[PDB]
Structures are given as C-alpha cells and as structure tokens.
C-alpha cells in the first residue's frame, strides 16, 4: 500500500507513509499532528468523514476545497496535501487535509498576557488576511479564535472561509449576522473587536445560549442602537429590536478599564489608549458608523507593523467532493 492504517482514539487513520508517529491534536473533525519524512518537517493532518453525508457538510467541505485552490498569501491557510486512501469514486469515504503544524489556536493565546507588540502585530495579521479575502470577493462572516493559529514567533493563520450566501460558536457574529441585516466587508471588523476585546477581557464579551441571549449582552455593554440603524432592519426584526428593554450601554473606559492593561512606562500607557480607541471603533453595532478594514489597517496601535508587503443529492457531493480532491 501507498498507505497505512493507525488507531488515534476511535477513528482510525489511514495516511500516506511520509506521514510518521501521529499524535491527536487540538479540539475535535479529527486532526493528528504528524512528521512529514518527505518535506522533513511537522504537519496537522485533519481527516474528513464522509464529507458529502448531508448537504450542509457538503457545500462547506466543498466550497471549501474550491476556495484554498484560489487564495495565497501567508496569514490564510494553505493545504500542503489533499489526499483519499480509497481508489475510486464508488469505494470513495474519507478527505485528508495536510497543513503545516502550527504551535497553539488563539483560545489558548486568549488566556495568557500578551504585551501590546504582540497583541497589536496578531489584530495586524488577522486584519490583512481579513484585506486578503475581501480582495477575492470572500466576506468571512464567522471569524472566530479556534479557526485561527498561531506561532511561537506570533505569525499567524486564519483556517476557515467562514458562511456562504445561504454546538456551534455564535459569540463573534456581527449583529447584521445576529439580525438578517444584509452586510460589507466591515462586518469581520466586528468578530476583531470582540476577539480584541477578549484578548483584553480574558472572557468572552458577548456570550449566550442563543441569539437573543448574545443580543441582550450586547446592547446592555453597548447600548440601545438607534434610528438610521434601525430602517435597515426588516419590520419584524425591527420590531422585537425596537421593543427591547433599553440600555444606555458603557464607554469604553468602564468597558475596558486600564487595570486589563500594560500600563507601566509611558509607551505603556499610550499603547493602551490607543488599543482603547480601535475597540471604540471596532466594537460598533451600526456598521454604517463601524471602521473599515483600511482604515483599522491605519489606525495607529496597527500601522507600526504596516507592510504594502446549488443544491446537490449526496451522489451528486460525493462526485464533486471528489474531483476535487483528484483534481480531475
Ligand atoms: C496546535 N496546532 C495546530 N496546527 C494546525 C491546525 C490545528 C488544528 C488543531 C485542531 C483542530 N483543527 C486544527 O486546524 C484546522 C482548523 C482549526 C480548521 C481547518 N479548516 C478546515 N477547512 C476545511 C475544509 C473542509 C473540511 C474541513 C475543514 N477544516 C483545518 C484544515 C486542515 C487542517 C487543520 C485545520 N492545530
């Protein structure tokens, strides 16, 4: 066999042979990191189930695969690999996903202190692999910190594409994804912010069971939002928002109080002001008043680091999945 089979917990694994001492990682679909014999060094090898088994995990794995192809630059995932043991279409199961290893997800970077150089250079990352995407017509819309990776020497990746135009973590949804609003580009500036303000916080900012849940954290640390926003809403929607029980909502001092920061040495303390204002700019409801991309990518706690630099059957997901992978 090209291939070899291996136990990692319940589901076996079944690789290419350059792939050596599979170790389970992170949290789950299953990946392994592994050595590569052939690239000489380490990678994340997530294993695909049945991809095309419902048309939700289709269109997603799907789109997904069809996305990577396009897409290249250094804060957004590349595959390495793709690969399926099986022969044919017919015996046709499992996708294999090769990247590089990266060393932790932002979950876990989210729990530690950071000081304001490495703090400020990951929102840098992340907003020019945000630039990136929009570039190629791809709005993220579900940027959220266990799709996204770092190093130890803080480069960084986004793993995902996020929703197409059509339990699972909601907390850094935009409020025009919370509330069917229509969307631009700045609707990711706000899964920033709350990943910013998360960063500082070391909780999450916005939590809940559910969408009215996650709406009523919001509005009462934010505020009720107001007029021009309101109109954009669908009458129903309107509705249940324009009848909610009102908040004045908090300035961002009392949001964000200086004890969460680096605030030692002059440099210090202006870093902090300055990462104040992005998150007054990022953490906006209205999106007609929030930052752009551009604009957060000139704001000056980031430009320090500034560098130009359909529906198918399961038979039919199956046959696309697969071509993809064979690329034929
Ligand atoms: C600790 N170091 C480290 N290094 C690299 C990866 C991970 C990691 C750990 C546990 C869970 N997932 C992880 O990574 C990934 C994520 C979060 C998302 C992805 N996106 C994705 N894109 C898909 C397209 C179709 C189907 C599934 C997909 N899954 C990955 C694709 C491939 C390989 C890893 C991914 N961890």
Same mark, same amino acid.
């Given at each position: 066999?090209?291939?070899?089979?291996?136990?990692?917990?319940?589901?076996?694994?079944?690789?290419?042979?350059? $792939?050596?001492?599979? &170790?389970?990682?992170?949290?789950?679909?299953?990946?392994?990191?592994?050595?590569?014999?052939?690239?000489?060094?380490?990678?994340?090898?997530?294993?695909?189930?049945?991809?095309?088994?419902?048309?939700?995990?289709?269109?997603?794995?799907?789109?997904?695969?069809?996305?990577? &192809?396009?897409? *290249?630059?250094? *804060?957004?995932?590349?595959? @390495?690999?793709?690969?399926?043991? %099986?022969?044919?279409?017919?015996?046709?199961?499992?996708?294999?996903?090769?990247?590089? =290893?990266?060393?932790?997800?932002?979950?876990?970077?989210?729990?530690?202190?950071?000081?304001?150089?490495?703090?400020? $250079?990951?929102? $840098?990352?992340?907003?020019?692999?945000? +630039?990136?995407?929009?570039?190629?017509?791809?709005?993220?819309?579900?940027?959220?910190?266990?799709?996204?990776?770092?190093?130890?020497?803080?480069?960084?990746?986004?793993?995902?594409?996020?929703?197409?135009?059509?339990?699972?973590?909601?907390?850094?949804?935009? !409020?025009?994804?919370?509330?069917?609003?229509?969307?631009?580009?700045?609707?990711?500036?706000?899964?920033?912010?709350?990943?910013?303000?998360?960063?500082?916080?070391?909780?999450?900012?916005?939590?809940?069971?559910? $969408?009215?849940? %996650?709406?009523?954290?919001?509005?009462?640390?934010?505020?009720?939002?107001? /007029?021009?926003?309101?109109?954009?809403? %669908? /009458?129903?929607?309107?509705?249940?928002?324009?009848?909610?029980?009102?908040?004045?909502?908090?300035?961002?001092?009392?949001?964000?109080?200086?004890?969460?920061?680096?605030?030692?040495?002059?440099?210090? +303390?202006?870093?902090?002001? %300055?990462?104040?204002? =992005?998150?007054?700019?990022? @953490?906006?409801?209205?999106?007609?008043?929030?930052?752009?991309?551009?604009?957060?990518?000139?704001?000056?706690?980031?430009?320090?680091?500034?560098? !130009?630099?359909?529906?198918?059957?399961?038979?039919?997901?199956?046959?696309?999945?697969?071509?993809?992978?064979?690329?034929?």
């Amino acid at each position: 066999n090209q291939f070899y089979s291996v136990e990692v917990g319940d589901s076996t694994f079944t690789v290419l042979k350059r $792939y050596q001492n599979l &170790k389970p990682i992170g949290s789950g679909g299953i990946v392994c990191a592994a050595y590569d014999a052939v690239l000489d060094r380490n990678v994340a090898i997530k294993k695909l189930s049945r991809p095309f088994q419902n048309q939700t995990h289709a269109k997603r794995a799907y789109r997904e695969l069809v996305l990577m &192809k396009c897409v *290249n630059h250094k *804060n957004i995932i590349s595959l @390495l690999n793709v690969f399926t043991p %099986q022969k044919t279409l017919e015996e046709f199961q499992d996708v294999y996903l090769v990247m590089e =290893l990266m060393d932790a997800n932002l979950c876990q970077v989210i729990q530690m202190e950071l000081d304001h150089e490495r703090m400020s $250079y990951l929102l $840098y990352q992340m907003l020019c692999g945000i +630039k990136h995407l929009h570039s190629a017509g791809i709005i993220h819309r579900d940027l959220k910190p266990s799709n996204i990776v770092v190093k130890s020497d803080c480069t960084l990746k986004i793993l995902d594409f996020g929703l197409a135009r059509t339990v699972v973590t909601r907390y850094y949804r935009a !409020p025009e994804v919370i509330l069917g609003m229509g969307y631009k580009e700045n609707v990711d500036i706000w899964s920033v912010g709350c990943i910013m303000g998360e960063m500082v916080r070391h909780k999450i900012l916005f939590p809940g069971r559910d $969408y009215i849940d %996650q709406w009523n954290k919001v509005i009462e640390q934010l505020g009720t939002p107001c /007029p021009e926003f309101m109109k954009k809403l %669908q /009458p129903t929607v309107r509705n249940y928002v324009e009848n909610r029980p009102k908040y004045a909502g908090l300035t961002f001092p009392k949001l964000f109080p200086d004890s969460l920061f680096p605030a030692d040495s002059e440099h210090n +303390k202006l870093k902090a002001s %300055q990462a104040r204002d =992005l998150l007054s700019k990022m @953490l906006v409801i209205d999106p007609a008043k929030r930052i752009s991309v551009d604009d957060a990518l000139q704001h000056p706690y980031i430009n320090v680091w500034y560098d !130009p630099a359909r529906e198918h059957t399961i038979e039919e997901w199956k046959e696309l999945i697969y071509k993809e992978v064979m690329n034929s």
